Protein backbone atom coordinates (compact mmCIF):
# COMPACT_ATOMS: atom_id res chain seq x y z
CA UNK A 1 0.00 0.00 0.00
CA UNK A 2 2.69 2.42 -1.12
CA UNK A 3 1.63 5.57 -3.00
CA UNK A 4 3.61 4.51 -6.06
CA UNK A 5 1.60 1.29 -6.17
CA UNK A 6 -1.69 2.84 -5.00
CA UNK A 7 -1.18 5.37 -7.78
CA UNK A 8 0.18 2.84 -10.27
CA UNK A 9 -2.87 0.59 -10.03
CA UNK A 10 -5.12 3.48 -11.12
CA UNK A 11 -3.38 4.38 -14.38
CA UNK A 12 -4.12 2.72 -17.68
CA UNK A 13 -1.82 -0.32 -17.89
CA UNK A 14 -0.02 -1.25 -21.07
CA UNK A 15 -1.79 -4.64 -21.13
CA UNK A 16 -5.26 -5.66 -19.99
CA UNK A 17 -4.05 -8.44 -17.67
CA UNK A 18 -2.13 -5.88 -15.68
CA UNK A 19 -5.13 -4.00 -14.26
CA UNK A 20 -5.97 -5.23 -10.75
CA UNK A 21 -8.42 -4.17 -8.05
CA UNK A 22 -6.54 -2.67 -5.05
CA UNK A 23 -9.07 -1.48 -2.39
CA UNK A 24 -9.73 2.22 -2.63
CA UNK A 25 -9.71 3.34 1.01
CA UNK A 26 -6.34 1.97 2.10
CA UNK A 27 -4.65 0.39 -0.91
CA UNK A 28 -4.61 -3.22 0.26
CA UNK A 29 -3.77 -5.51 -2.66
CA UNK A 30 -5.07 -8.91 -1.54
CA UNK A 31 -8.62 -9.74 -0.41
CA UNK A 32 -10.44 -6.97 -2.29
CA UNK A 33 -14.09 -7.32 -3.19
CA UNK A 34 -15.64 -6.23 -6.49
CA UNK A 35 -19.06 -4.96 -5.44
CA UNK A 36 -17.65 -2.74 -2.71
CA UNK A 37 -14.15 -2.12 -4.00
CA UNK A 38 -13.08 -2.40 -0.37
CA UNK A 39 -10.77 -4.90 1.30
CA UNK A 40 -11.98 -7.06 4.15
CA UNK A 41 -10.76 -4.66 6.83
CA UNK A 42 -12.30 -1.55 5.32
CA UNK A 43 -15.47 -3.54 4.64
CA UNK A 44 -15.55 -4.64 8.25
CA UNK A 45 -14.89 -1.21 9.77
CA UNK A 46 -17.09 0.77 7.38
CA UNK A 47 -19.87 -1.81 7.56
CA UNK A 48 -19.61 -1.60 11.34
CA UNK A 49 -19.97 2.16 11.21
CA UNK A 50 -23.08 1.92 9.03
CA UNK A 51 -21.34 3.77 6.22
CA UNK A 52 -22.18 1.22 3.54
CA UNK A 53 -25.86 1.18 2.64
CA UNK A 54 -27.53 -1.95 3.89
CA UNK A 55 -24.77 -4.43 4.34
CA UNK A 56 -25.26 -5.54 7.93
CA UNK A 57 -24.20 -8.34 10.21
CA UNK A 58 -25.52 -11.74 9.23
CA UNK A 59 -27.32 -14.50 11.08
CA UNK A 60 -29.57 -17.06 9.47
Amino acid sequence: AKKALVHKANKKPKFAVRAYTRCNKCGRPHSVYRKFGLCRICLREMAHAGELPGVQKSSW
Binding site: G37, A47, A49, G50, E51, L52, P53
Partner: protein
Protein backbone atom coordinates in the same frame (compact mmCIF):
# COMPACT_ATOMS: atom_id res chain seq x y z
CA UNK B 1 -8.90 -9.30 24.61
CA UNK B 2 -12.21 -7.60 25.13
CA UNK B 3 -13.69 -8.81 21.84
CA UNK B 4 -16.47 -6.26 21.96
CA UNK B 5 -18.27 -5.57 18.68
CA UNK B 6 -18.89 -1.92 17.74
CA UNK B 7 -22.43 -1.46 19.11
CA UNK B 8 -23.45 1.00 16.41
CA UNK B 9 -22.58 -1.86 14.09
CA UNK B 10 -24.34 -4.35 16.34
CA UNK B 11 -27.67 -2.49 16.35
CA UNK B 12 -27.49 -0.99 12.86
CA UNK B 13 -30.37 -3.16 11.74
CA UNK B 14 -32.55 -2.69 14.80
CA UNK B 15 -32.30 0.75 16.40
CA UNK B 16 -29.49 2.84 14.93
CA UNK B 17 -30.06 3.93 11.34
CA UNK B 18 -27.47 3.74 8.58
CA UNK B 19 -25.47 6.89 8.03
CA UNK B 20 -25.43 6.64 4.22
CA UNK B 21 -28.66 5.90 2.37
CA UNK B 22 -29.35 5.15 -1.30
CA UNK B 23 -29.96 2.32 -3.74
CA UNK B 24 -27.28 1.26 -6.21
CA UNK B 25 -26.92 -1.49 -8.77
CA UNK B 26 -23.70 -1.34 -10.89
CA UNK B 27 -23.04 2.16 -9.51
CA UNK B 28 -22.20 1.01 -5.99
CA UNK B 29 -18.39 0.92 -6.12
CA UNK B 30 -18.40 4.48 -7.46
CA UNK B 31 -20.79 5.63 -4.73
CA UNK B 32 -18.51 3.97 -2.16
CA UNK B 33 -15.44 5.75 -3.59
CA UNK B 34 -17.19 9.14 -3.53
CA UNK B 35 -18.47 8.45 0.02
CA UNK B 36 -14.90 7.75 1.20
CA UNK B 37 -13.32 10.80 -0.40
CA UNK B 38 -16.15 12.98 0.95
CA UNK B 39 -15.58 11.75 4.52
CA UNK B 40 -11.82 12.33 4.18
CA UNK B 41 -12.61 15.81 2.87
CA UNK B 42 -14.88 16.44 5.86
CA UNK B 43 -12.39 15.03 8.38
CA UNK B 44 -10.01 17.96 8.86
CA UNK B 45 -11.78 21.33 9.01
CA UNK B 46 -14.89 19.87 10.56
CA UNK B 47 -12.81 18.00 13.15
CA UNK B 48 -11.57 21.45 14.04
CA UNK B 49 -15.21 22.55 14.01
CA UNK B 50 -16.78 19.88 16.19
CA UNK B 51 -18.19 17.33 13.76
CA UNK B 52 -20.24 14.41 15.07
CA UNK B 53 -22.23 12.88 12.20
CA UNK B 54 -21.78 12.85 8.43
CA UNK B 55 -24.84 11.49 6.65
CA UNK B 56 -24.98 11.26 2.86
CA UNK B 57 -28.39 10.82 1.30
CA UNK B 58 -28.04 10.32 -2.45
CA UNK B 59 -30.92 11.00 -4.86
CA UNK B 60 -30.69 10.81 -8.69
CA UNK B 61 -27.03 11.88 -8.86
CA UNK B 62 -27.37 15.21 -7.13
CA UNK B 63 -25.97 14.43 -3.71
CA UNK B 64 -27.11 15.42 -0.24
CA UNK B 65 -24.38 15.76 2.37
CA UNK B 66 -25.72 16.50 5.84
CA UNK B 67 -23.58 17.10 8.92
CA UNK B 68 -24.60 17.04 12.58
CA UNK B 69 -22.21 19.19 14.60
CA UNK B 70 -22.01 21.14 17.87
CA UNK B 71 -21.46 24.73 16.63
CA UNK B 72 -23.21 26.26 13.64
CA UNK B 73 -20.91 29.25 13.53
CA UNK B 74 -17.60 27.49 13.02
CA UNK B 75 -18.94 25.27 10.24
CA UNK B 76 -20.85 28.29 8.92
CA UNK B 77 -18.43 31.19 9.24
CA UNK B 78 -19.25 34.04 7.01
CA UNK B 79 -22.31 32.74 5.11
CA UNK B 80 -21.06 30.94 2.03
CA UNK B 81 -17.45 31.83 2.77
CA UNK B 82 -16.85 28.94 5.15
CA UNK B 83 -19.85 26.90 3.99
CA UNK B 84 -19.59 27.29 0.21
CA UNK B 85 -15.82 26.73 0.18
CA UNK B 86 -15.96 23.19 1.57
CA UNK B 87 -19.28 22.80 -0.27
CA UNK B 88 -17.70 23.91 -3.55
CA UNK B 89 -14.68 21.66 -3.01
CA UNK B 90 -17.14 18.81 -2.45
CA UNK B 91 -18.71 19.87 -5.76
CA UNK B 92 -15.34 19.70 -7.52
CA UNK B 93 -13.83 16.58 -5.93
CA UNK B 94 -17.02 14.65 -6.62
CA UNK B 95 -18.21 14.85 -10.22
CA UNK B 96 -21.58 16.02 -8.90
CA UNK B 97 -23.34 18.95 -7.26
CA UNK B 98 -23.64 19.19 -3.48
CA UNK B 99 -26.59 20.23 -1.30
CA UNK B 100 -24.89 20.62 2.08
CA UNK B 101 -27.25 20.73 5.07
CA UNK B 102 -25.65 21.66 8.39
CA UNK B 103 -27.44 21.22 11.72
CA UNK B 104 -26.82 21.47 15.46
CA UNK B 105 -27.22 18.78 18.12
CA UNK B 106 -29.39 20.02 21.02
CA UNK B 107 -26.76 18.84 23.51
CA UNK B 108 -23.12 18.13 22.58
CA UNK B 109 -22.25 16.39 25.85
CA UNK B 110 -24.66 13.50 25.23
CA UNK B 111 -23.31 12.57 21.81
CA UNK B 112 -20.75 9.84 22.42
CA UNK B 113 -18.76 11.02 19.41
CA UNK B 114 -18.61 14.59 20.71
CA UNK B 115 -17.76 13.40 24.22
CA UNK B 116 -14.88 11.48 22.66
CA UNK B 117 -13.97 14.70 20.79
CA UNK B 118 -13.84 16.86 23.90
CA UNK B 119 -12.11 14.21 26.01
CA UNK B 120 -9.38 13.38 23.49
CA UNK B 121 -8.82 17.04 22.60
CA UNK B 122 -8.36 17.73 26.30
CA UNK B 123 -6.01 14.75 26.56
CA UNK B 124 -3.76 16.10 23.82
CA UNK B 125 -3.70 19.37 25.79
CA UNK B 126 -1.62 18.03 28.74
CA UNK B 127 -4.44 17.90 31.29
CA UNK B 128 -4.78 15.23 33.96
CA UNK B 129 -6.45 12.23 32.35
CA UNK B 130 -8.37 11.04 35.40
CA UNK B 131 -9.54 14.62 35.83
CA UNK B 132 -10.56 14.80 32.17
CA UNK B 133 -12.64 11.65 32.08
CA UNK B 134 -14.03 12.27 35.56
CA UNK B 135 -15.13 15.57 34.02
CA UNK B 136 -15.94 13.91 30.75
CA UNK B 137 -18.67 12.45 32.86
CA UNK B 138 -19.91 14.52 35.74
CA UNK B 139 -21.26 16.82 33.03
CA UNK B 140 -22.84 14.28 30.71
CA UNK B 141 -24.22 12.23 33.58
CA UNK B 142 -26.99 14.58 33.59
CA UNK B 143 -28.08 17.33 31.79
CA UNK B 144 -30.31 15.66 29.44
CA UNK B 145 -31.50 12.26 30.05
CA UNK B 146 -28.76 9.74 29.74
CA UNK B 147 -28.83 6.53 31.63
CA UNK B 148 -25.25 5.32 31.27
CA UNK B 149 -21.76 6.27 30.41
CA UNK B 150 -18.49 4.32 30.16
CA UNK B 151 -15.12 5.84 29.26
CA UNK B 152 -12.00 3.82 28.49
CA UNK B 153 -8.56 5.28 27.78
CA UNK B 154 -5.58 3.23 26.64
CA UNK B 155 -2.19 4.31 25.42
CA UNK B 156 0.66 6.30 26.95
CA UNK B 157 -1.38 7.93 29.71
CA UNK B 158 0.55 10.82 31.22
CA UNK B 159 3.52 10.06 28.98
CA UNK B 160 4.40 6.86 30.82
CA UNK B 161 6.05 3.93 29.07
CA UNK B 162 3.39 1.39 29.99
CA UNK B 163 0.12 1.51 28.08
CA UNK B 164 -2.37 1.55 30.95
CA UNK B 165 -6.06 1.22 30.13
CA UNK B 166 -8.54 3.02 32.37
CA UNK B 167 -12.19 2.27 32.95
CA UNK B 168 -14.59 4.73 34.57
CA UNK B 169 -18.40 4.64 34.46
CA UNK B 170 -21.71 5.56 36.11
CA UNK B 171 -25.12 3.92 35.92
CA UNK B 172 -26.30 1.27 33.46
CA UNK B 173 -24.62 0.52 30.14
CA UNK B 174 -25.92 -2.86 28.89
CA UNK B 175 -24.22 -3.85 25.65
CA UNK B 176 -25.81 -7.29 25.21
CA UNK B 177 -29.29 -5.80 25.28
CA UNK B 178 -30.31 -4.83 21.76
CA UNK B 179 -33.08 -2.39 22.74
CA UNK B 180 -30.39 -0.15 24.19
CA UNK B 181 -30.12 2.97 21.95
CA UNK B 182 -26.43 3.19 22.86
CA UNK B 183 -24.34 5.86 21.22
CA UNK B 184 -20.70 4.90 20.80
CA UNK B 185 -17.75 7.05 19.91
CA UNK B 186 -14.03 6.41 19.79
CA UNK B 187 -11.72 9.31 19.04
CA UNK B 188 -7.97 9.25 19.41
CA UNK B 189 -5.91 11.87 21.23
CA UNK B 190 -2.64 12.98 19.67
CA UNK B 191 0.03 13.78 22.24
CA UNK B 192 3.72 14.10 21.53
CA UNK B 193 4.30 10.82 23.37
CA UNK B 194 1.71 9.17 21.15
CA UNK B 195 -1.99 8.55 20.68
CA UNK B 196 -4.52 8.01 23.47
CA UNK B 197 -7.51 6.15 22.04
CA UNK B 198 -10.65 7.11 23.93
CA UNK B 199 -13.84 5.03 23.80
CA UNK B 200 -17.11 6.44 25.13
CA UNK B 201 -20.35 4.48 25.56
CA UNK B 202 -23.52 6.45 26.33
CA UNK B 203 -26.76 4.63 27.18
CA UNK B 204 -29.69 6.99 26.66
CA UNK B 205 -32.58 4.70 27.42
CA UNK B 206 -34.59 1.48 27.32
CA UNK B 207 -36.88 2.90 24.61
CA UNK B 208 -37.39 0.74 21.52
CA UNK B 209 -39.68 3.30 19.89
CA UNK B 210 -40.49 0.77 17.18
Amino acid sequence: MGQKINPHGFRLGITTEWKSRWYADKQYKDYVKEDVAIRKLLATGLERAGIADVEIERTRDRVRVDIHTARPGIVIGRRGTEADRIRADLEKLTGKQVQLNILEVKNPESQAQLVAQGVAEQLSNRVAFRRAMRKAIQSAMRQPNVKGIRVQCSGRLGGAEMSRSEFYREGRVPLHTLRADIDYGLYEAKTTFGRIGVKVWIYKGDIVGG
